[PDB]
Design an enzyme around this catalytic site. Structure first.
Site, mmCIF file in Angstrom:
data_model
loop_
_atom_site.group_PDB
_atom_site.id
_atom_site.type_symbol
_atom_site.label_atom_id
_atom_site.label_comp_id
_atom_site.label_asym_id
_atom_site.label_seq_id
_atom_site.Cartn_x
_atom_site.Cartn_y
_atom_site.Cartn_z
ATOM 1 C CD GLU B 247 -3.123 0.970 2.227
ATOM 2 O OE1 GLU B 247 -3.408 -0.087 2.853
ATOM 3 O OE2 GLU B 247 -3.563 2.109 2.562
ATOM 4 C CG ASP B 280 -1.056 7.068 -2.326
ATOM 5 O OD1 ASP B 280 -1.181 6.666 -3.509
ATOM 6 O OD2 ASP B 280 -2.034 7.436 -1.633
ATOM 7 C CG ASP B 283 -2.598 8.129 2.720
ATOM 8 O OD1 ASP B 283 -3.108 9.275 2.714
ATOM 9 O OD2 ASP B 283 -3.280 7.092 2.844
#
Lengths: 543, 543, 543
Positions: B247, B280, B283
């Site tokens: 993630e 990302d 974040d």
């Protein structure tokens, strides 16, 4: 077994087995564990017999005053030391619940409380900072001097790792090649939290503050006195964070302290952050006739060859100056200063170069006369000014290039400003009916543009038409006189003429003509300077 | 001897002498050595009796699930811990041998293999990332949840140094003043590799990730939930490197988690690098009606006073957004984002200032609508765009200054763009027969320049001659109308005239004349606006 | 008791109990303390039996040559190791007391002295650096090879912390996942101070230099041979400081060494400083037909896909090149190079992007032809040139944008230079009677501006009047021809006319007229190109 055990086990004595720290110190061979709180008296001195020891702390050293460690062998390390005062003094907390600075003396006096943290003991400097606080402060909150200090004295190659404490202080006196590593956020007391003092013996060398952070304290977080890292730049502050210093985050002393010089040379100040100092973020000046240092005849005031290696520093929230310094022939780079109450940068430097400096929203409380000040003949290459919020920059003798930001041109004062190496240019205008390229001669006026090259829309958006106009100021009225190309999509040039008889001196160059008005005959004449230089008046347009 | 030995040796128990970890924990005094692999069962809890211990690991903790360490005294440190799962799950590796991202679901499903590293276990977020992968994935590669997690529970002042592992996880639950220091590149599992979770009790404070690196993992590398470092900014991620996060590299949670807020305030995110995150790089948003946090009436969506100290971050290779965040009144600086598949920066910020931002070659896969997006009224000072490779920047309400790069002007949308403080200018043209200074009014057209000031060569190189021309667009044809000076070295001014009878409304200012064509007499006339404002038509040139 | 003692004490053997290091190594279980100086012979090898040991050094390893440590278990760490040679060789010190570099061979030979620090043993490279020194050096100061080297051989997961020494060297041969952490300023010897060599077996991976500093040494401070950190960029130099390297600060080898490739891929070079190297600050090139590497047919010379992660580097005082490298498709950012004797940057890169580069006062000794050189088709976004002190930049095939600094335009050579995205502009002139916007077509002339838009004061300061003038160069005389608006506050336009009969070819566009002189009648005529394109000569002004 004893023979065997003696050769297979790790040596270490622990404080719980001894009555005094010196007894434990005398028994120590390799390791020494502080496994119980120890109350020391100010001045209590421990002699380590030149042993290279590994001191592991798992308890506190409690006492007001200094705990002196001497004769530690080169290579000794102390980890986890926690200093704590026995006294809980009166502290002021000059900031609100919204983290707003209080600048009112009565408001600050109202913050008084007894605590070992979350504020600091007032000092004389506060008398200056919060005007009239001296007369408002109650006698018991004045002249306090509480600090539980670990003093390492005249040692070489000793490192203190992950130190912490309440109203704590760490003093290296007459030390060399010592380091304060990963300070585990000690809360400061009356004195500097980390001090490298070498007023006696040789100039300090090899002394560093590496990593970690500190909070509070009445004065500066990290500070050096009479240290010189040499050409090798052996010493300094690298990767350190200071929060809410009662004075400055990082400070190199100035002037004569005692009978000698407290100044510093060849140190590193890099990759560090200083947030919310009551005074300055970085105070790297040397001068405030220099016993123990260069004479004024050799180096004038503020012009010492300090030679510090200064790079990648960040400062935010200073009630004072974000970054201050003096010296000659300095190279400074990658400094970012944001949201400061006083000057973001106060530079008493000469013949120095500043590269990529960003001063964003400083002097918010008008403490100084400008956001950035440079006194001497300096060079600035890359200067970002103005964030989202008196001159902005006052560098009378400096040459600047590459300023970015929504700066007010009338608030800029420099010796020279130029962009010599730009390529082909495009002025992109957004939110307006025109784009512009303005010219401002600050000698004529700092507030009015002297000329301009515009492009204005003809009709409305999407017309596919605009008119270009070249202008000049007259009678202090910008754009008073102008030539246009394509006004109202007419596709012709509108030319301005002298409203009256043009005087001989009006025409400048040969092989040029200057149209002028002759009202008495509704004629347009032309003052002509022939290619040979002679003047002749010709009739240009008539009825 | 025993008396003596007891006082001269370093205390330490080793796991090889005990059947269970708790037994070793109960015997421990000062040190504890993990000298043999230990297989734990999920939920296995160890109570350390509030002892300040130094745990040295030289073996692995093997097991799927959590190994819970509780009641460690303030000052405890664990070094070298290696977490390893017992299960070898199915992992996907969405990148090629040339390090190219695979975005095709069938291509990614083809990468399936059983391994404890070099890929990650698919999660629901991947269903969104690689469209249709949900229906392509075999049932055994779905819903996996393998993670060998070291959970430190409700402790204060505990530090984990040089941790590592395979399918490893490190969870600080309800902790304060704890640090993850120098993570020795652990390979992540299903959960976050480093998580500071404080959904219960006080908001987390003093929790940091200092240095080190991590690799892989299904979700985010470092993540915080309900942490607030206070004004002192006590907490954050500093000097950390994240590689290939399933993630994001660094993430601060958003919205309600459970029954409370998972949001974070006053943290530091500095001197860090995030490379190749599947999502990302950073974040740092807080919002996605805020139980446990500020109400929407106080702070609207995406406008919380987050106050993070954000500086010196680098992001490269993100399949998602390089740097994302929201909040109001934020100060962000020195961010460099290179080679990203989606937006380099997605900013849902209001009343914030961004200083020295570099967005180089992002949105390379058109995942977003732009390279950089800013929603609210923000200020950007210094923006470097375009590397060597849809709008580039869409910041409708922001004021920008100092953009550098080979940007396409028609791909810029901002509220205002200005260079107020440049000095004397020089446009240097290379590789062309002319130099130019163009004007573009985006209200008229975003694709066509409305006017220009050129300089064109007369003859060839080294002629020592050029002609200057001032132009204006007409009929959507740039440069349609123009005035020239020295065309063909003639040394005169070529002036454009209205091709027909000039209408009264064509002339703008008094004391000006506008030449126009009178075809019926082969004459050049002149519409004149006298200094008094009256109009008169005069004959200018005739046969 | 023995049973108890065996389970409650920390295991550790100390060198003072053994005759040889191997004996101590054979007895070691957990810890090993070097508590007495140990004199080793070159080649002395110690086998650690694959034990995961913690070696704590409190004494020196004395000897010329190599002390070989083999078979250390993964997870072993050596702290405080001090290497010292037995020989005190002859060293040169090519810098003055004012820290000025000596470039004269006779001057450098004069610095000869026997010392273990504060200079270095001359090597063949010095023969090139100080021309004629080879014939001046006395035979005893030539061909020396003194280095007390700790060689870690074919180990994995071993870390050396806080190492130091005199004429010291640290060699990792055939190692993986090893780190040189916080080097405590060792003074170098003849060989590299820190070397990661993987010419045999697999390419080195996981090898780092983290933090710390080194001083002196005859060659490079940190250097890698045949290392590849993979896509994960597992390896490199981060947060390191090098001072006075006899060769370069940080170096990745080039070409064939032995029978294989010494080149490196996917490494990190970040947050580091290199000061006063006798050669280069950072030598990150790979090429100088590539056994063991990519063939020239695949990747041409200087075009290897090196892929290093390069960011935030500082270089100052290099006698050579500040930053050098080659490769294709590289992304480089935030590099600051100040005060270098040779080129600040020598870039043999192709299809690479450089963002935010600052080259301040380099090539001060004209060693090279320029301050910055880029050979291939590259992109530079943000280039700060000139500090306070031959081309400045020679990048024939590169496109540049955003140059700042007091650069001499005639010293710039690039493929293209453009500022496409600036907003509305203002040229602010300080210290002059005029502001200017100049145009320079380098094809016409690199030394003369081809045109300009000026604004000059009319009268004196505070007049509220100025005149705007548009100019063009003619006869190699800049500003030869010009149009003025408001000269002497006359409020009219002064227009230049052809000094003679204008030739048909002088007029360019239709619907324009060009005034010209007719001396034979003291008349001003006008060459007119009608809207239909036809030419006609009309009388403009007469007596």
């Amino acid at each position: 077994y004893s023979i065997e055990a003696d050769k297979k086990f790790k040596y270490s004595v622990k404080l719980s087995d001894y009555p005094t720290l010196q007894d434990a110190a005398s028994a120590a061979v390799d390791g020494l564990l502080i496994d119980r709180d120890y109350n020391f008296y100010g001045g209590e001195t421990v002699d380590f017999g030149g042993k290279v020891l590994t001191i592991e702390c798992k308890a506190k050293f409690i006492g007001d005053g200094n705990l002196i460690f001497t004769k530690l062998g080169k290579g000794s390390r102390i980890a986890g030391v926690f200093m704590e005062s026995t006294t809980t003094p009166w502290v002021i907390k000059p900031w609100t619940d919204d983290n707003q600075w209080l600048t009112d003396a009565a408001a600050v006096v109202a913050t008084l409380k007894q605590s070992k943290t979350d504020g600091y003991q007032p000092t004389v400097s506060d008398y200056v900072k919060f005007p009239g606080i001296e007369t408002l402060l109650p006698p018991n909150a004045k002249g306090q001097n509480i600090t539980s200090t670990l003093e390492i004295r005249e040692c070489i190659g000793v490192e203190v790792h992950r130190a912490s404490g309440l109203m704590a202080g760490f003093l290296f006196r007459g030390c060399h090649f010592c380091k304060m590593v990963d300070a585990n956020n000690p809360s400061g007391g009356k004195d500097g939290i980390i001090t490298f003092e070498n007023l006696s013996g040789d100039w300090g060398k090899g002394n560093y503050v590496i990593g970690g952070r500190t909070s509070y304290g009445s004065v500066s977080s990290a500070q050096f006195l009479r240290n010189n890292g040499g050409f090798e730049r052996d010493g300094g502050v690298i990767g350190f964070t200071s929060y809410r210093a009662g004075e400055s985050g990082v400070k190199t002393w100035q002037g004569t302290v005692g009978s000698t010089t407290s100044r510093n040379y060849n140190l590193q100040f890099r990759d560090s952050v200083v947030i919310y100092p009551v005074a300055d973020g970085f105070d790297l000046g040397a001068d405030t006739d220099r016993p123990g240092d260069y004479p004024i005849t050799q180096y004038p005031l503020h012009q010492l060859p300090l030679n510090h290696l200064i790079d990648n520093l960040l400062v935010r929230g200073a009630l004072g100056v974000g970054f201050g310094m003096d010296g000659k022939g300095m190279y400074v780079s990658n400094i970012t200063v944001e949201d400061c109450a006083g000057s973001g940068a106060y530079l008493l430097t000469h013949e120095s170069v500043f590269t990529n400096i960003a001063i964003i929203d400083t002097n918010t409380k008008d403490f100084q006369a400008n956001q950035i000040y440079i006194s001497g003949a300096c060079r600035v290459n890359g200067l970002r000014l103005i964030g989202i919020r008196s001159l902005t920059i006052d560098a009378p003798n400096s040459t600047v290039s590459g300023i970015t930001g929504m700066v007010d041109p009338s608030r800029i004062n420099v010796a020279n400003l130029a962009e010599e190496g730009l390529g082909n240019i495009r002025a992109n205008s957004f939110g307006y009916d025109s784009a512009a390229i303005k010219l401002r001669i600050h000698k004529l006026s700092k507030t009015l543009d002297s000329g301009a090259l515009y492009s204005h829309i003809n009709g409305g958006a999407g017309s596919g038409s605009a008119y270009t106009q070249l202008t000049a100021i007259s009678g202090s009225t910008p754009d008073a006189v102008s030539l246009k190309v394509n006004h109202k999509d007419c596709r012709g040039a509108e030319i301005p003429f002298v409203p009256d008889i043009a005087s001989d001196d009006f025409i400048k160059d040969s092989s040029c003509f200057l149209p002028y008005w002759e009202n008495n005959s509704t004629s347009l004449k032309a003052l002509v300077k022939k290619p040979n230089g002679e003047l002749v008046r010709l009739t240009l347009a008539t009825l």
